[PDB]
User: What shape does this take?
Amino acid sequence: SNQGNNQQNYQQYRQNGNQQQGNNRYQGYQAYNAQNNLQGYQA
Amino acid sequence: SNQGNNQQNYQQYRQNGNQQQGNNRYQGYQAYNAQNNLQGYQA
Amino acid sequence: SNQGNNQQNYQQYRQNGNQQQGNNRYQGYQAYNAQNNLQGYQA
Amino acid sequence: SNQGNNQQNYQQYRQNGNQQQGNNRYQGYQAYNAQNNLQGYQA
Amino acid sequence: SNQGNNQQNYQQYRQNGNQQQGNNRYQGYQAYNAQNNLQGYQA
Assistant: This one.
């Protein structure tokens, strides 16, 4: 929840990578481009 | 939760890499570009 | 949780690398560009 | 948790490398650029 | 947890390298640039 006051640029460029608890299987691709953009996964 | 007051640039550029607890399998690609951007995984 | 008061630039550029507890398998790529950006993994 | 008061630049540029406890396998690439950026892994 | 009071520049530029306990295998690249940046691993 956003319950704060006075904060400028709060977590402005924060990035959180993979979080897994338990017995989980993840295969996939997540990409965000905010603007020539090459984001490429070629397994 | 955001329950704070007076904080400027709180965790502005924070990055958290992989967090796994248990028996988890992750294969994947996560990329964010905020702006020529080459982000490339060529396994 | 963010329960603090008066902190400027709290963890502004903090980076946390891989954290694994248990029996976990991770193969992947995580990249964030905040701005010519070349971030490249060519295994 | 952030439960502190009066701290300026708390852990402003802190970096935590790999932490593994148990039987874990990690292969991957984590890079953050906050600004010509060349971050390259060419195994 | 951050449960402190009065600390300025607490661990401002602290760096923690690899920590492994048990039977773990890590191959990878972690780089953070906060600003021409060349960070290069060419095994």
About this structure: Chains E and A do not touch (no CB pair under 8 Å).
